[PDB]
Structures are given as C-alpha cells and as structure tokens.
Structure 1
Amino acid sequence: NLCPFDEVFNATRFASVYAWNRKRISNCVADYSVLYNLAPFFTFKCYGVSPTKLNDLCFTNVYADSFVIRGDEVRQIAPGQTGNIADYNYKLPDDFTGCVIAWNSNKLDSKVSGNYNYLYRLFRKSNLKPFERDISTEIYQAGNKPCNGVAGFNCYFPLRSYSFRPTYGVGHQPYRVVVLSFELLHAPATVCGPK
C-alpha cells in the first residue's frame, strides 16, 4: 500500500524538535511524487540507501521523525555531527540507514511577530542517546548551588523558544525536517520491489 507520507509531509503542525513526532509506517510503497512535490529541498540526503531506489529496499517498518529546526542547524541532522540539536534534541546513529529530507517552511512556520511556539532543548546534563526523546522540564543546574526547582542564577529552564520571523536570514529561517529510518530486513543490495 502507498505510504501515508501525506500525513508525514503535509502535516498541519510539525513537532518541536525536542518533541519530534515519530510515525511508524508498516511496509509501504513510496509515492515519490509526494516527496518530489516539496522541492526545492535544502537537504535530501540518504545514508546507506540510494534515494531513487527506496522502493527496491527490503524493509518492514519505516519510522518518519518530523520536527522544525533552523536552516543552519539542518547540518546537524546527519550522523556524527555535534551541536545543540544533535547533542540535546535529536541524535542520528552513526550507522543510520535512511534519508533526511529538509525543506524551507518560512511561509508556514514564521510570523512577523515571531513564532515562539517551536521549542528546543538548550541544556542537558549529557548527550542524547540515538533516537532518544527527552521532553523533561527539570531545571538545569549549571553550578554548585542546587536550584530547588526555581529558575535563576545557574538555574535555567531547559527549553528555549526559536524566533521565526519572515524577515530573518535564510540560515535563521524555519526548516521542516523529516527523517526516514528503515528497519532493513536484509541489506540495501537485496531487492524486494513491488511485483
């Protein structure tokens, strides 16, 4: 059956990157017209998989992970990269077999007053494990005084709002990102294409 990429790519509201939405899709056929209708992509990168041969891929589940990030941070949605998004929000495993698709969403997600609805985690005690989700709001103790649950000096609320305004530079504009991760049944070399 055709993948519900309609719900993945034309979702009305994307997730905050810390609350990145995961959809599990049972073995499905990629309608590439759904993907390609979004162009130009800032990123359409695939690791291990050939982007045009996604239907030849022997897979049982695809996970689509959807979130909004800044355009200059889209670099960090790749294996081995480091920075606030990789380290504290969404870590790709180094052995990722999948695609990262990122398109500019300045038209939808910014507002002239600034859209402060998209949160990202700025502080965490240790790096995020691959595909770990946090969504905690415990005050981050950055110093030798425990915070007692009150924000203050060395006592930060872990989440910070992105500022998205139409007028911001291309690097500071909101990009929607979808990560497709495939549970491969055998290997990219084995062919299981629809008959």
Structure 2
Amino acid sequence: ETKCTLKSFTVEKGIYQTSNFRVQPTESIVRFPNITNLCPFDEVFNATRFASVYAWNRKRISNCVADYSVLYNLAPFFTFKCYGVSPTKLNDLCFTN
C-alpha cells in the first residue's frame, strides 16, 4: 500500500502516511425503554363522527406502541406529503410527545 499511495513501484527511503486504523464494533444493542400497550389509534381513525373545522377535536396519545401497518390498509393509496420525516421510517425512529 506504500507502493499504491505513491503511484509507483520503487519507493524511496523515508516515512509516508498510508492510512488510519479504526477499531471495528463487536456487537449491537437496541435498548429503547420497557413499555408495552396497544395504542388508541383505533378510536381516532375509526370514529363515526369527526368535529367541525372551526372547533376541531382534541386527542392526547401516550404510552403506546407506534405500529404503522394499518394506515395503508384502512384506505387505498393517497397522499401523505410528509415534511419532517419520510413516511416509511416511522417505526424505527421513535416518537416524542
């Protein structure tokens, strides 16, 4: 690799800068917190009546599991137009408030 970095075949006497050494990872750990419970997403999407525009409904959601599998199955494909995040990464990133 000294011959590779000088682009030659007969390197001269001296000191060179070949590359750098990185300690590689050994294993992997995934430790999001110990919480488990089915989410109230079924009320907000399968509600019979929604509120009007001028007085729109309020919902607080907490202590769930963020399952985003039934979203594509309740209705056919339509727009998402998702700004902060891509729509397909929602499960991995985890959610705050």
TM-score by length of 1: 0.28
User: Per the alignment, do residues 38 and 26 of structure 1 end up closer, same or farther by CA in structure 2, a change over 3 Å counting?
Assistant: same
Q: Which residue of 2 aligns with 1:47?
A: 83
2:96 corresponds to: 60
- Structure number with greater Rg is 2
Tell me which residue corresponds to 2:53. 17
Gaps of 5+ in 2: 1-36
Q: What CA deviation, in whole Å up to 9, does each residue of 1:72-91 have, x standing for no partner?
A: xxxxxxxxxxxxxxxxxxxx
Partner of 1:3: 39
Corresponding letter in the other structure for 2:81:
K
Q: How does 1:146-165 map to 2 (within 5 A)?
A: none
Task: Count how many residue pairs are aligned between Structure 1 and Structure 2.
Answer: 61
Q: Higher RCO, 1 or 2 (CA under 8 Å, sep at least 6)? A: 1
Give, in whole Å, the separation in 2 of the partners of 1:2 and 1:46: 24
Listed as ranges, the matches of 1:55-94 within 5 Å are 55-61=91-97
1:42-67 CA-partner distances (Å, limit 9, x unpaired): 32222111211112233232xxxxxx
Q: 1:41 to 1:14 in 2, by over 3 A?
A: farther
User: Could you list the runs of 4 or more consecutive aligned residues of structure 1 that deviate by over 3 angstroms after TM superposition?
Assistant: none
**Cα distance change, pair 29–50 in 1 and its aligned pair in 2 (3 A):** farther
Tell me if the contact between 2:68 and 2:90 (Cα under 8 Å) persists in the aligned partners: no
Q: Deviation of residue 10 (structure 1)?
A: 0.3
User: Which residue of the partner structure matches residue 73 of structure 1?
Assistant: none
Q: Could you tell me how far apart the structure 2 residues matched to 1:41 and 1:19 are?
A: 28
Query: Quick one: which of 57, 70, 74 aligns to 1:38?
Result: 74
TM-score by length of 2: 0.50
Which consecutive residues of structure 1, in runs of 5 or more, have no partner in the other structure?
A: 62-195
Q: Which has the higher strand share?
A: 1
Alpha carbon RMSD of aligned pairs, Å? 1.9
- Return closer, same or farther for 1:42/1:17 CA change in 2, 3 Å cut-off: farther
Aligned match of 1:71? none
Give the distance between the partners of 1:60 and 1:27, measured in 2 at CA: 11
What secondary structure sits across from 2:75 in the alignment? coil
CA contact (8 A) 1:2 1:29 kept: yes
Q: Write the distance in 1 (CA, Å) between the matches of 2:76 and 2:94.
A: 28
